[PDB]
Design an enzyme around this catalytic site. Structure first.
Site, PDB file in Angstrom:
ATOM      1  N   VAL C 142       0.857  -1.180   0.000  1.00 19.97           N
ATOM      2  CA  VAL C 142       0.000   0.000   0.000  1.00 19.97           C
ATOM      3  C   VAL C 142       0.893   1.229   0.000  1.00 19.97           C
ATOM      4  O   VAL C 142       1.826   1.324   0.807  1.00 19.97           O
ATOM      5  CB  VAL C 142      -0.944   0.019   1.213  1.00 19.97           C
ATOM      6  CG1 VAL C 142      -1.913   1.187   1.108  1.00 19.97           C
ATOM      7  CG2 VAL C 142      -1.683  -1.294   1.334  1.00 19.97           C
ATOM      8  N   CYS C 143       0.611   2.168  -0.897  1.00 15.97           N
ATOM      9  CA  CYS C 143       1.403   3.382  -1.027  1.00 15.97           C
ATOM     10  C   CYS C 143       0.503   4.604  -0.901  1.00 15.97           C
ATOM     11  O   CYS C 143      -0.462   4.749  -1.656  1.00 15.97           O
ATOM     12  CB  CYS C 143       2.037   3.265  -2.427  1.00 15.97           C
ATOM     13  SG  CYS C 143       2.658   4.831  -3.142  1.00 15.97           S
TER      14      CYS C 143
END
Ligand SMILES: O=P(O)(O)O[C@H]1[C@H](OP(=O)(O)O)[C@@H](OP(=O)(O)O)[C@H](OP(=O)(O)O)[C@@H](OP(=O)(O)O)[C@H]1OP(=O)(O)O
Ligand SMILES: *P(=O)(O)OC[C@H]1O[C@@H](n2cnc3c(N)ncnc32)[C@H](O)[C@@H]1O
Lengths: 76, 988, 291, 76
Positions: C142-143
């Protein structure tokens, strides 16, 4: 008529506009009050990403709903 | 160059430095402490040819200043040069050392000195030094002239590289790279840097440019710059060129620098000193005047002043007064400086000598290589702060008593030595710093008192080939041995009275059981030699729990720092932050590399995942499930399994022999280096544009390009060999070295085809096929799990990683890197040098004396250094900070509140006790990382009626625990006021 | 209907669950799958204390500020003794390709919190077989800009004093889940409204729809996680009819583009996969008991 | 008023400040040219460490004064 709009810092902006406020006029007004470029201003509400040309009443929804924004999507 | 012994040195210096320092001849005179330490430092550097010189002989007093002499040498009255030549020869087989005893005087011919290239002088008379400097400087080319001397707590340093000296690198800092955003065809031209990222440059610097669209003429050219804005500057005229299209890369260009020096005699009338303490900029001039007056008195009376001889003091003061007016600046006179210098003119102090020797060796390195900016032109180090806090001590305490410590007693007196012999110090880490720690402590005779005085060292590390370069305590026959034990054995030779404990333990919370707070309180001061900040923070929290003095230092390359902490006086180590390594989004790392480090990191991570994570997952999966037919049945029944697809794909793709592994390596290369670029370009054509119409493939992005394989390419063959050997090692497939021959591999690949570029049922089919082939045996569910090893030359880790990084640079049109730089980056190896570590070791050993003295807050200092300039600073440490909360209640970092409870003691009892005792109610209670009472989370309200022994569940060995509390802010919605540490006892 | 939906489920937005059991030796025995084994087991330093106060303050807000609506709702579980071990599930927004979905995340708090943004990963990756959103990596990475830091733009990054956990939740639930994730990739919004871009968007949306039909409902119900078990049983129980209606609408829409030639074969493959998923999905829903 | 900030490794930074400015704003001005966060930087003047919450007049900083920027190291 005024409005409610929140942001990252959560400012709930409340400023008078016109009932036929075109979203390009909205970009102009946002850059008047803050100076931020319209390119970051990808306004979204009611499932609609706002397109400039049509007016405020052209969408048939009216004031006082807390609206918000999305940035131009930068990648991870 | 044998990298196994100079890997760090190569990164510090560079190949040109090693080439220049090779075939070098250095003459040093004076076998004192200063000469000995400079000699050991330079031998550690590794000069091919060094010649020492001395004419004197051993004395009982020389025992306290020399760490290689022996009582037998003093008995035999040997020349000091001869008795140490063997020991110094033991340091480096590649260094040739010669000893000399030729008498020197005004009549001595100096023509023989032309063989060397630099000269070091110590313990020499001034007029002869002037004559030598004149002779050396008159040479063509002139010979570098170096002199330094130490008297008690006073040091003098001078340098002379002739009329003109050349520097090939002013700073030694790698130039940066930028991205060009816009350029204007104007006179002068205006250059706009990319968005953000200020250039941080300066006017007048030179940059070279490349891949500029429109102005192809500006590519390959070097332009002197003129900073205009943080993100723009000016260049030459560009109106005659084409319009700017896009792109462009600018990199700074280094420029050689020429400096100048002067003769010794001229510099005596107006020394160009260097300031290290801005608090008293006038002190160095007075110190120089005092040194000159001392030289005058010594020349006149052929003797040093006697302690308690006030006539000597007034004579020296009158001499200095006569000298001061004669000076060009005509400074004033510092009476206390003269008095203290006269009082302790006959003492010798070890850590000051060590620091001076380190800096002198570094300056010799600057002379021989020209790689750094030399010091100009004077230096004076001093440690008067130690004797300033003594009030008015008597001259009798300084009188010698006929022991090896006579010089130290003449310096500071017997009482401080007595306090020194009783100290119980703890040492963590046994790196290069720890060795010279132990050496300095042996020189000081610490802990030699039988009743009290103890030293402890713990290190799990063993001895390695590269460690011998920095660690002189260890020998080539000590490889693969505990650092602590070998260091103790080496050090105990110098002094038999040393009481030392050596351990192989690694400090950590798990091992805290042996290191109980009683042990900490038993200790008096702690010294750190750690290389990681996590252990540093843990040790800080440990020491703060005992209100114990602590010393910390750290060095990378030519830079070093020292820090001091005192109970109830200063702040903690954790009171300041440290910048960690920045994060890189895969949006760069995986897909859009822009620098060689990105490819290096990607290759490292791919190696790690492939050869460490995957085998461990496979073996865990196949130890969780005993039978493969069981797994097949569970899949057929629809049950879900963790990681089943990956393990079944791996097992179906299990090679059986050497040729299968070779084919696997070839196809892996094909996928990694051909298909990815094709897919990326398919998803994004080179001409794809953005909303503005700007190219998507603009800066900093680089378009990739597929690569066609060639066995004749040595890089391709090397990478294929690396991949094949790694695969064979992993899958426990034995093989012969002759299989790695290019001919055999060509025979293998001559019949190998490659597929072109473009679930549950397939997995079940493959599993059934493996089952019917009896490929599900117990041995089949196994492979070796590998670990990265950068210190092995045959395992091929570095070879494979470097090849992959170079290829990954290649398809992205990026300049590759050699093996050494790739290894350094992958291992994140920290460069270091003996000079900096020796100097910081001397500094911290010196500050240890002030720590022992119990001196006021003003006596202590912290120093940060960068000899590349060179630059040294001394500053007063931060004072303790006060923290108020409410109702006038304030506390510090050293304050700790304590409450005694009972077995029936409850949470409401604790709240009542704390609120009664301190006037504030703890709004929350947490034991370390596990909470104990937070009213927000449901069910903590019922926790108020619980036994605290029950709610804590502590360990029996500890009679108390420390918890964290807070308090409600005066204004609701604000963050809760933090509380000072609270120590709760289960009983009285 | 939606009134009852919001009313029943309001009591379950915030709650706690036990995941880690410590033995006499201090070993950490995890009762469920958690992406952060090594980080939790190795990082045992208790030096951090301001993180405890920050999370204590956060617990007040997160206990009342959880979004809850027919379109999307937020439910979170956390360890009953530790503080850096998080789990959360969200319901997919209405009319999106992720409509009425259910996805799980694992969130770890670093010791240096709040000076650093925490960690977060996907959990319904289908064994990393599905890459869901440009901003969603198939492996589970997840960014978020507020969850990361570089040179870039200052205000967007993780601000220790102003950036908050609830802001991250809102950013995820809103920006990650959109009506048309196909143009999420920068450089593709240049071709908005174009027939080729529209066709590619339709194909991508069909792919996302069939993938989420396969994984976000069937796999979740068949092997639910122990933590959010009752919650998902209640939520999916209520929305069965609307789920069937949207599945039929999707299938009818998917059938419309099978006559194409450029995308016809893949489009029909998506149709077949969707029908195959719905075949078992209808049976599974018919077997679902009332909570 | 003009002041200089000399960091180790020889880099020199030019700053514009006026007395009455606060140390925290002075150090935040550094970020506009270096990118170093305020919490990560220690600056030294005349052998003393400049504490937060004070102003330049307290430390008696005048025109063309020199301040040093220092950092701690990790190797050992
Ligand atoms: O498991 P990882 O180390 O993360 O590497 C995988 C793996 O590639 P390798 O087997 O060559 O190491 C995948 O291949 P599979 O084993 O899953 O088939 C591949 O997926 P594709 O083969 O479908 O391309 C994927 O690449 P991606 O995530 O781009 O699909 C790639 O990841 P990395 O190369 O980034 O590690
Ligand atoms: P440099 O890397 O030359 O030397 C450092 C030495 O210190 C040891 N060390 C690191 N970390 C610890 C802890 N936590 N406890 C004890 N010793 C430690 C290294 O092994 C090096 O020998």
């Amino acid at each position: 008529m005024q409005i409610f709009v929140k942001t990252l810092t959560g400012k709930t902006i409340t400023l008078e506009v016109e009932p036929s406020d075109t979203i390009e006029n909205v970009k102009a007004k946002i850059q008047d009050k803050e100076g931020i470029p319209p390119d970051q201003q990808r306004l979204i509400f009611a499932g609609k990403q706002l397109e400039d040309g049509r007016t405020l009443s052209d969408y048939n929804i009216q004031k006082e709903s807390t609206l918000h924004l999305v940035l131009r999507l930068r990648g991870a | 160059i044998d990298d196994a012994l100079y890997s760090r040195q190569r990164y510090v210096l560079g190949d040109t430095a090693m080439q220049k320092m090779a075939k070098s001849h250095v003459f040093l005179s004076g076998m004192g402490g200063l000469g000995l330490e400079i000699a050991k430092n330079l031998v550690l550097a590794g000069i091919k040819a060094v010649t020492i010189h001395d004419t004197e002989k051993c004395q009982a007093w020389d025992l306290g200043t020399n760490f290689f002499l022996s009582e037998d040498d003093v008995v035999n009255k040997r020349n000091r040069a001869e008795a140490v030549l063997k020991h110094i020869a033991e340091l480096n087989p590649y260094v040739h050392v010669t000893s000399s005893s030729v008498p020197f005087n005004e009549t001595t011919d100096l023509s023989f000195l032309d063989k060397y290239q630099c000269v070091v002088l110590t313990e020499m008379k001034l007029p002869l030094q002037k004559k030598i400097n004149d002779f050396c400087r008159s040479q063509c080319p002139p010979i570098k002239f170096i002199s330094a001397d130490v008297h008690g707590i006073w040091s003098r340093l001078f340098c002379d590289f002739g009329d003109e000296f050349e520097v090939l690198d002013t700073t030694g800092e790698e130039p940066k790279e930028i991205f060009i955003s816009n350029i204007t065809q104007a006179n002068p031209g205006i250059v706009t840097c990319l968005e953000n990222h200020p250039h941080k440059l300066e006017t007048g610097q030179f940059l070279t440019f490349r891949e500029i669209n429109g102005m192809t003429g500006l590519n390959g050219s070097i332009q002197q710059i003129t900073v205009i804005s943080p993100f723009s500057f000016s260049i030459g005229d560009t109106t005659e060129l084409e319009p700017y299209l896009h792109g462009g890369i600018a990199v700074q260009v280094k420029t050689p620098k020429t400096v100048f020096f002067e003769s010794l005699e001229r510099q005596l009338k107006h020394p160009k000193c260097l300031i290290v303490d801005f608090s008293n900029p006038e002190a160095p001039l007075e110190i120089h005047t005092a040194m000159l007056a001392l030289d005058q008195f010594q020349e006149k009376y052929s003797r040093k002043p006697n302690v308690g001889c006030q006539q000597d003091s007034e004579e020296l003061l009158k001499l200095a007064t006569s000298i001061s007016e004669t000076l060009e600046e005509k400074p004033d006179v510092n009476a206390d400086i003269v008095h203290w210098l006269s009082w302790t003119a006959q003492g010798f102090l070890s850590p000051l000598a060590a620091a001076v020797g380190g800096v002198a060796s570094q300056e010799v390195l600057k002379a021989v290589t020209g790689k750094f900016s030399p010091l100009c032109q004077w230096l004076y180090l001093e440690a008067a702060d130690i004797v300033e806090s003594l009030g008015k001590p008597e001259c009798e305490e300084f009188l010698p008593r006929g022991d090896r410590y006579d010089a130290l007693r003449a310096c500071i007196g017997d009482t401080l030595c007595q306090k020194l012999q009783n100290l119980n110090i703890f040492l963590v880490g046994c790196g290069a710093i720890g060795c010279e720690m132990l050496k300095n402590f042996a020189l000081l005779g610490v802990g030699t008192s039988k009743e009290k005085g103890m030293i402890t060292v713990t290190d799990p590390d063993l001895i390695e080939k590269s460690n011998l370069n920095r660690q002189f305590l260890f020998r080539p026959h000590h490889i693969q041995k505990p650092k602590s034990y070998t260091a103790a054995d080496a050090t105990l030779k110098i002094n038999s009275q040393i009481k030392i404990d050596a351990h192989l333990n690694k400090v950590c919370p798990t091992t805290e059981t042996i290191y109980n707070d009683e042990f900490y309180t038993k200790q008096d001061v702690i010294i750190t030699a750690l290389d990681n900040v996590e252990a540093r923070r843990y040790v800080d929290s440990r020491c703060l729990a005992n209100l114990r003095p602590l010393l910390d230092s750290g060095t990378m390359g030519t830079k070093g720092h020292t820090e001091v902490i005192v109970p109830h006086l200063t702040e903690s180590y954790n009171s300041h932050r440290d910048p960690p390594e920045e994060e890189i989004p895969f949006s760069t790392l995986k897909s859009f590399p822009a620098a060689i480090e990105h490819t290096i990191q990607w290759a490292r991570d791919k190696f790690e995942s492939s050869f460490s994570h995957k085998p461990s997952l496979f073996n865990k999966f196949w130890q969780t499930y005993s039978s493969a037919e069981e797994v097949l049945q569970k899949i057929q029944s629809g049950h879900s399994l963790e990681g089943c697809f990956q393990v079944i794909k791996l097992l179906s793709r299990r090679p059986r022999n050497w040729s299968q592994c070779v084919e696997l390596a070839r196809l892996k290369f094909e996928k990694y280096f051909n298909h990815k670029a094709l897919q990326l370009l398919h998803c994004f054509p080179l001409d794809i544009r953005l909303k503005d119409g700007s190219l998507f493939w603009q800066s900093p992005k680089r378009p990739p390009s597929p690569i066609k394989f060639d066995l004749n390419e040595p890089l391709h063959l090397s990478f294929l060999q690396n991949a094949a050997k790694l695969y064979a090692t992993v899958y426990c497939i034995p093989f012969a070295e002759e299989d790695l021959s290019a001919d055999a591999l060509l025979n293998i690949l001559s019949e190998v085809k490659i597929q072109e570029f473009k679930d549950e049922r397939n997995a079940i089919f493959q599993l059934e096929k493996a089952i019917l082939s009896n490929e599900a045996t117990k041995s089949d569910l196994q492979m070796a799990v590998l670990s990265f090893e950068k210190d092995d030359d045959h395992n091929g880790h570095i070879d494979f990683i470097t090849a992959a990084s170079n290829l990954r640079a290649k398809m992205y049109s990026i300049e590759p890197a050699d093996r050494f730089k790739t290894k350094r980056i992958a291992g994140k190896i920290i460069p270091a040098i003996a000079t900096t570590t020796a100097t910081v070791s001397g500094l911290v050993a010196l500050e240890m004396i002030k720590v022992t003295g119990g001196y006021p807050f003003e006596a202590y200092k912290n120093c940060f250094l960068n000899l590349a300039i060179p630059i040294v600073v001394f500053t007063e440490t931060t004072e303790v900070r006060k923290t108020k909360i409410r109702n006038g209640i304030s506390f510090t970092i050293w304050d700790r509140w304590t409450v005694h409870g009972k077995e029936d003691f409850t949470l409401l009892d604790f709240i009542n006790a704390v609120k009664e005792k301190y006037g504030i109610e703890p709004t929350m209670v947490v034991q370390g990382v596990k909470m104990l009472y937070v009213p927000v989370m449901p069910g903590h309200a019922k926790r108020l009626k619980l036994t605290m022994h029950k709610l804590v569940k502590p360990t029996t060995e500890k009679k108390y625990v420390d918890l964290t509390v807070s308090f409600a802010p005066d204004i609701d919605g604000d963050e809760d006021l933090p509380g000072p540490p609270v120590r709760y006892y289960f009983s009285h | 209907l939606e009134e009852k939906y919001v009313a029943v489920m309001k009591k379950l937005q915030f709650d706690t669950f036990e995941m880690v059991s410590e033995d006499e030796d201090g070993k950490l025995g995890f009762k469920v799958n958690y992406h952060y084994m090594s980080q939790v087991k190795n990082a045992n330093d208790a030096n951090s204390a301001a993180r405890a106060r920050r999370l204590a303050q956060e617990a007040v807000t997160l206990s009342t500020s959880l979004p809850l609506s027919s379109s999307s709702s937020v439910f979170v579980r956390c360890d009953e003794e530790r503080l850096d071990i998080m789990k959360v599930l969200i319901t997919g927004p209405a009319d999106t390709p992720y409509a009425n979905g259910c996805f799980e995340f694992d969130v770890y708090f670093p010791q240096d919190y709040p000076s650093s943004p925490p960690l977060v990963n996907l959990e319904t990756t289908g064994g990393h077989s599905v890459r869901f959103n440009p901003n969603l990596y198939n492996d589970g990475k997840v960014c978020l800009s507020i969850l990361n830091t570089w040179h870039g733009r200052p205000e967007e990054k993780w601000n220790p004093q102003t950036s908050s956990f609830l802001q991250v939740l809102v950013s995820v639930q809103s920006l990650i889940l959109v009506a048309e994730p196909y143009f999420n990739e920068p450089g593709y919004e240049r071709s908005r409204g174009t027939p080729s871009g529209t066709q590619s968007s339709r194909e991508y949306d069909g792919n996302i729809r069939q993938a989420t039909v396969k994984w976000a409902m069937l796999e979740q119900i068949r092997n639910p996680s122990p933590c959010f078990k009752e919650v998902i049983h209640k939520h999916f129980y209520l929305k069965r009819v609307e789920i069937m209606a949207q599945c039929e609408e999707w299938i009818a829409d998917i059938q419309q583009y099978s006559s194409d030639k450029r995308v016809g074969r893949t489009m029909s493959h998506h149709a077949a996969a969707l029908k195959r998923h719905t075949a078992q999905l209808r049976e599974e829903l018919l077997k679902l008991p009332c909570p």
